Amino acid sequence: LRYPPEMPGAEVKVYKKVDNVDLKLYIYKPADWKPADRRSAIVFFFGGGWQSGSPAQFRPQCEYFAGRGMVAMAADYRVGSRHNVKVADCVADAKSAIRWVRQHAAELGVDPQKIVASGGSAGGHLAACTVMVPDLEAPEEDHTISSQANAAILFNPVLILSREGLKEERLRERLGTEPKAVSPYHHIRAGLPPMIIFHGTADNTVPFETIRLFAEAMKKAGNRCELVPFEGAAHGFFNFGRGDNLAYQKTLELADEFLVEIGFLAPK
């Protein structure tokens, strides 16, 4: 991956101006697109530990889902190696992206109620923050337009950020807030949007146990929260180019059937 990314064929829209930085959405429209459609949308957040990464990471997935009838985009967001930000600022950026898409749903040809948030690792964390973590919103935006996504597709996300529980200072200094405030696990509750999670059993960056604990506690609250374990796979397994795209093709396959499952996508 490179940054700045190369995104051929994508339409470029600035969704947020902050610190004189113009944060961009790379939008991939389907074939039979008109401003009057009400298609589902998916917004991808790249990974890279809230410090690096590139919107090009999920460009392959955008092209796939746009070919399947969605308005697919990859969001840029501020990161530590480029901008003076902490994790809490990254969350505000991800929320701005969802709010912007909903605010512009009419011109995007999008159903404001079928907006999916998605991401890998740190960007999987952000996507989950847009469905279940409160506040951390850009203070000058219209809070009467909801920043909450309607579904989430998570690729080995980080879901537990605070040790407030059973079983360090470097982390608290890159968070920009109390650890619980940026931790999806400590905001599990009933009535949350549906979601599907792809995680590796041998993940040594984000332990699989932290995700299975999240998913179980999410089911006892009545939410749709499906784990798809990938046996022996490690952090990053899903990415286009890993092995020979067996995980990439299967994650796309199980994500497609999940969007059909909740009604955001039409059968083939």
XYZ file of C-alpha atoms in Angstrom:
268
model
C 0.000 0.000 0.000
C 0.991 3.620 -0.645
C -0.101 6.940 0.817
C -1.417 9.092 -0.838
C -3.471 6.298 -2.392
C -4.120 5.670 -6.056
C -7.870 5.145 -6.593
C -8.633 5.039 -10.333
C -12.255 5.531 -11.328
C -13.236 6.706 -7.845
C -15.055 9.998 -7.420
C -13.362 12.233 -4.853
C -15.472 14.142 -2.319
C -14.190 16.070 0.701
C -16.334 15.014 3.678
C -14.579 17.061 6.375
C -12.295 20.067 6.628
C -10.370 20.084 9.903
C -7.034 21.693 10.818
C -6.964 22.879 7.189
C -6.846 19.205 6.137
C -9.377 18.117 3.479
C -10.354 14.538 4.329
C -11.594 12.638 1.288
C -14.055 9.894 0.391
C -13.227 7.705 -2.607
C -16.646 6.776 -3.987
C -17.343 3.878 -6.379
C -20.797 3.964 -7.957
C -22.538 0.951 -9.554
C -23.370 0.613 -13.242
C -27.014 1.750 -13.278
C -26.596 4.686 -10.902
C -28.913 7.710 -10.813
C -29.238 10.399 -8.128
C -32.726 9.016 -7.364
C -31.713 5.480 -6.344
C -31.890 4.437 -2.703
C -29.047 1.924 -2.655
C -27.246 0.725 0.422
C -23.811 2.205 1.064
C -20.621 0.926 2.665
C -17.824 3.094 4.090
C -14.437 1.415 4.611
C -11.900 2.528 7.245
C -8.348 1.344 6.663
C -6.117 -0.108 9.369
C -2.730 0.940 10.655
C -2.926 1.381 14.424
C -4.452 4.879 14.189
C -0.975 6.002 13.026
C -0.633 4.925 9.375
C -2.388 2.981 6.609
C -4.085 3.926 3.365
C -7.573 4.173 1.834
C -6.179 1.956 -0.928
C -6.338 -1.011 1.480
C -10.047 -1.590 0.820
C -10.110 -0.370 -2.793
C -10.555 -3.984 -4.047
C -13.587 -4.420 -1.785
C -15.075 -1.119 -2.983
C -14.887 -2.215 -6.618
C -16.549 -5.523 -5.732
C -19.434 -4.048 -3.758
C -20.038 -1.277 -6.305
C -20.295 -4.002 -8.943
C -22.920 -5.621 -6.695
C -25.101 -2.485 -6.679
C -23.814 -0.550 -3.651
C -22.306 2.908 -3.363
C -18.958 1.843 -1.910
C -16.380 4.276 -0.572
C -13.091 4.266 1.287
C -12.634 7.112 3.757
C -9.393 8.851 4.535
C -9.104 9.881 8.171
C -6.440 11.594 10.268
C -3.706 9.382 11.734
C -0.854 9.817 14.167
C 2.070 9.703 11.739
C 0.605 12.442 9.523
C -1.529 14.593 11.820
C -1.421 15.608 15.475
C -4.310 13.326 16.457
C -5.221 10.686 19.025
C -7.620 7.764 18.659
C -10.525 9.926 19.853
C -9.982 12.279 16.908
C -9.979 9.320 14.498
C -13.373 8.383 15.935
C -14.690 11.881 15.265
C -13.476 11.586 11.675
C -15.159 8.213 11.141
C -18.388 9.634 12.560
C -18.093 12.641 10.254
C -17.844 10.261 7.280
C -21.037 8.407 8.187
C -22.864 11.659 8.960
C -21.716 13.161 5.650
C -22.959 10.190 3.621
C -26.309 10.291 5.396
C -26.522 14.070 5.007
C -25.831 13.720 1.256
C -27.836 10.512 0.780
C -30.121 12.152 -1.791
C -27.307 13.223 -4.114
C -25.415 9.978 -3.465
C -28.393 7.844 -4.470
C -28.281 6.239 -1.017
C -30.879 5.030 1.467
C -29.896 7.003 4.611
C -30.998 3.913 6.581
C -28.774 1.397 4.750
C -25.310 2.819 5.472
C -22.740 0.154 6.434
C -19.541 0.930 8.344
C -16.596 -1.384 7.746
C -12.902 -1.548 8.449
C -9.826 -3.560 9.353
C -8.004 -3.528 12.707
C -7.874 0.133 13.842
C -10.445 0.913 11.138
C -12.563 -1.992 12.298
C -12.477 -0.308 15.704
C -13.645 2.966 14.145
C -16.471 1.273 12.236
C -17.663 -0.334 15.481
C -17.403 3.074 17.154
C -19.841 4.457 14.566
C -22.445 1.834 15.536
C -22.149 1.607 19.298
C -19.715 4.060 20.929
C -21.368 7.351 21.946
C -20.286 10.979 21.615
C -16.805 11.870 20.293
C -18.540 13.811 17.555
C -17.124 16.736 15.602
C -18.395 19.656 17.726
C -19.312 21.913 14.775
C -21.402 19.370 12.831
C -25.212 19.012 12.824
C -25.815 16.531 15.607
C -29.459 16.247 14.510
C -28.085 14.213 11.597
C -27.143 10.865 13.121
C -23.576 9.620 12.693
C -24.571 6.041 13.571
C -24.182 3.398 10.858
C -27.030 0.931 10.241
C -24.813 -2.187 10.078
C -21.145 -3.084 10.368
C -18.705 -5.476 8.694
C -15.554 -5.821 10.794
C -12.205 -7.298 9.688
C -10.244 -8.403 12.807
C -11.227 -5.237 14.701
C -9.859 -3.924 17.969
C -12.873 -4.025 20.291
C -11.412 -3.901 23.842
C -9.296 -0.861 24.712
C -9.510 -0.665 28.533
C -8.281 -3.113 31.171
C -11.248 -2.218 33.446
C -12.064 -5.859 34.040
C -10.640 -9.231 34.938
C -7.961 -11.029 32.915
C -0.353 0.434 29.028
C 0.620 4.084 29.550
C 1.745 4.119 25.916
C -1.882 3.395 25.020
C -3.557 5.967 27.287
C -1.318 8.653 25.761
C -2.403 7.884 22.181
C -6.134 7.670 23.024
C -7.013 11.305 23.752
C -9.651 10.276 26.316
C -10.409 7.786 29.054
C -9.825 4.270 27.645
C -13.423 3.133 28.183
C -14.715 6.023 26.064
C -13.069 4.641 22.905
C -13.698 0.969 23.698
C -16.612 -0.734 21.883
C -16.696 -3.619 24.368
C -17.660 -1.343 27.280
C -20.717 -0.045 25.376
C -22.416 -3.348 24.506
C -26.172 -2.873 24.893
C -29.493 -3.921 23.392
C -30.901 -2.614 20.131
C -27.638 -2.140 18.248
C -27.315 -2.491 14.451
C -26.497 -5.876 12.898
C -22.879 -6.774 12.289
C -20.580 -9.578 11.141
C -16.963 -10.053 12.246
C -14.087 -11.919 10.560
C -11.303 -12.766 13.003
C -8.299 -15.082 13.048
C -7.918 -17.712 15.749
C -4.123 -17.223 15.903
C -4.256 -13.408 15.917
C -1.329 -12.157 18.008
C -2.190 -8.442 17.689
C -5.875 -8.714 18.684
C -6.506 -11.944 20.638
C -9.479 -13.934 19.356
C -10.792 -14.329 22.921
C -11.472 -10.589 23.202
C -13.717 -10.849 20.127
C -15.590 -14.031 21.095
C -16.262 -12.438 24.485
C -17.577 -9.364 22.658
C -19.764 -11.432 20.319
C -21.268 -13.586 23.083
C -22.087 -10.583 25.286
C -23.578 -9.003 22.150
C -25.925 -11.969 21.588
C -27.179 -12.070 25.194
C -28.250 -8.473 24.495
C -30.336 -9.573 21.504
C -28.106 -8.183 18.736
C -27.069 -9.866 15.496
C -23.311 -10.350 15.954
C -21.896 -13.225 13.898
C -18.285 -14.350 14.300
C -16.640 -16.161 11.413
C -13.429 -17.701 12.788
C -10.595 -18.314 10.337
C -8.678 -21.277 11.728
C -5.036 -20.519 12.465
C -5.136 -17.246 10.524
C -3.296 -14.191 11.828
C -3.792 -10.424 11.870
C -4.375 -9.180 8.324
C -5.382 -12.547 6.821
C -8.379 -11.073 4.988
C -6.450 -8.599 2.857
C -6.373 -8.779 -0.937
C -3.072 -10.520 -1.685
C -2.834 -12.691 1.444
C -2.001 -16.256 0.463
C -3.902 -16.275 -2.814
C -7.088 -14.452 -1.767
C -8.794 -17.455 -0.181
C -9.537 -15.421 2.944
C -10.203 -12.312 0.843
C -12.650 -14.196 -1.377
C -14.356 -15.935 1.552
C -14.733 -12.760 3.624
C -16.271 -11.083 0.570
C -18.530 -14.121 0.130
C -19.734 -14.230 3.744
C -20.098 -10.439 3.809
C -22.213 -10.481 0.639
C -24.530 -13.126 2.101
C -24.784 -11.032 5.281
C -25.880 -7.903 3.405
C -28.544 -9.985 1.656
C -29.410 -11.441 5.064
C -30.317 -8.012 6.478
C -31.837 -6.690 3.239
C -29.182 -4.238 2.022
C -28.280 -6.249 -1.102
C -30.199 -8.155 -3.804
C -29.622 -11.839 -4.626
C -27.414 -12.657 -7.613
